[PDB]
Ligand binder design. Sequence first.
Ligand SMILES: [NH3+]Cc1ccccc1
Ligand SMILES: [Ca+2]
Length: 223
Amino acid sequence: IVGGYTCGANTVPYQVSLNSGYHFCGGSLINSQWVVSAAHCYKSGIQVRLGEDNINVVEGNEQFISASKSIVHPSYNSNTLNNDIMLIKLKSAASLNSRVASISLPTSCASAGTQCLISGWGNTKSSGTSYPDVLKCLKAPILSDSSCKSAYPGQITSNMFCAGYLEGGKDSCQGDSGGPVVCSGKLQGIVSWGSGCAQKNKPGVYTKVCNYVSWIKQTIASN
Ligand SMILES: [NH3+]Cc1ccccc1
Ligand SMILES: [Ca+2]
């Protein structure tokens, strides 16, 4: 996250870190046994880390649970990043409390102008590299589809939305991928892609979760 603020420990209780020896992507806890992330975060050998603030220090609220199954969306296209969504089942259920909690799925799609919260452990610089150890947060609005398509001609599908600031300065970045965009207490987006971080006229692009609720619910019910 570029241009954000330190969230505070366990203030984003649905945020997870995906770990393969190191943090590589975010995700969101949607019930005691399932996480949703980006398909472009797929790899084998995922450990899900819940209850994290500092990802390099054991602070006492962590739960570390290995994945038993990963399910990339049937129509994910790695060239265009259309359908950039994946489900991860945990080998055992997490223990839910105030500091480790699920986030609700949306019943309706959020409109442009809605303010959302984006969070992650990704790069904090637009030029160069500095990775934080504690969770960073950013408040940002959903942009109109017309502004999003104007920023990225030929690249925005109905399964994507833009959020952020056309003036630049504040954005998600590498290492935030897979993490949550929460608006009005519901999971509306997944950090997906963009051109660089925090550049003028190049806002972040997010997977539009409201288009996937039926797939999520049916997949969880049968796996
Ligand atoms: N600035 C949006 C973004 C770029 C690369 C990875 C994740 C997010
Ligand atoms: Ca920790």
